[PDB]
Amino acid sequence: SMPFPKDCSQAMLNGDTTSGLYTIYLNGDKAQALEVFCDMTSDGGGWIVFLRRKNGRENFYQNWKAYAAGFGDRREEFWLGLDNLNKITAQGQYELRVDLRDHGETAFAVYDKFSVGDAKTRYKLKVEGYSGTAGDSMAYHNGRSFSTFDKNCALSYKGAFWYRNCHRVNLMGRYGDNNHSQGVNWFHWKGHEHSIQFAEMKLRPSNFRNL
Ligand SMILES: Cc1nccn1Cc1cccc(C#N)c1
């Protein structure tokens, strides 16, 4: 095993094959411990989950400092934090996976290249290299800074995202809200008038597929 695994891929190769909470260490530094949820089953596992929607119990209409730091219950609905995402994606070349489920239907999106810039970039999104079944709804968002109501799409849709004008993805939107663009949306799968029951966003090294 590795003593200070820097993501869920290094924690999995540590032979831990059960999904759940694991400690990772940013840059492999024992002083930068972070508790994460590892999805060890989806497409080979080793995924850090950074967003989960499943029941509408958690409030996602939260401010910049909350989106920077992270919030929620890692075992249920939560947001990992933009500072964490910046520090993880800085460690190497990461891939994004999005898993969606609604009334028994599932879809997914993978982006071969995924990064989140630091606070001086207002946590700029990079997403490239789409494959999957959900439809490429992140392309619209590529290169955009993060937006919250206090730093306006976040206000208009009462959510937070790498908003443009405004969204094709709104996975931090209002749970079960089928009103146009208000809900947990992935436009090129279920449009803007259908809030998705279950959503996870997760990341791991892009080279994991053949390591
Ligand atoms: C540890 C801590 N103190 C304040 C904010 N955070 C970050 C946080 C909170 C809840 C869930 C996640 C995840 N994943 C991250």
Query: What resolution, expressed in A, was reported for this entry?
Result: 1.6
Give distance in angstroms: CA of 36 to centre of ligand 1.
9
Domain boundaries, the chain: 1-134+198-211, 135-197
Give distance in angstroms: CA of 66 to centre of ligand 1.
9
Pocket test for ligand 1, best of 23, 60, 78 (most atoms within 8 A of CB): 78
Please give all residues whose beta carbon lies within 6 A of any atom in ligand 1, as ranges.
36, 69-72, 74, 78, 80-81
**Pairing label, strands 33-39, 20-25:** antiparallel
Tokens of 103: 């009334």
b/e 155-190 (16+ beta carbons within 10 angstroms → b): eebebbbbbeebbbbbbbbbbebeeebbbbbbbbbb
Pocket test for ligand 1, best of 24, 58, 79 (most atoms within 8 A of CB): 79
Among candidates 81, 116, 84, 114, which has minimal Cα distance to 98?
A: 114
Give distance in angstroms: CA of 210 to centre of ligand 1.
31
Question: What is the number of the ligand 1 atom nearest to the C-alpha of 36?
Answer: 14
Among candidates 50, 57, 52, 49, which has minimal Cα distance to 176?
A: 57
Residue type, 86: N
Residue closest by Cα to atom 8 of ligand 1: 70
**DSSP assignment string, the chain:** --SS-SSHHHHHTTT--S-EEEEEEGGG-TTSEEEEEEE-SGGGS-EEEEEEESSS-S-----HHHHHH-EE-TTSSEE--HHHHHHHHTTS-EEEEEEEEETTEEEEEEEEEEEE--GGGTS-EEEEEEEESS---SGGGTTPPPB-TT--HHHHHTS-BS-SSS-SB-TTSBTT--STTTBS-BHHHHBSS---SEEEEEEEEGGGGG-
Among candidates 68, 56, 50, which has minimal Cα distance to 182?
A: 56
Rounded Cα gap, residues 155 and 148, in angstroms? 7
Among candidates 99, 125, 98, 128, which has minimal Cα distance to 112?
A: 128
Give distance in angstroms: CA of 153 to centre of ligand 1.
24
In angstroms, the Cα distances linking 99 to 80, 165, 170 are 16, 24, 14
In angstroms, the Cα distances linking 37 to 49, 125, 189 are 6, 22, 26
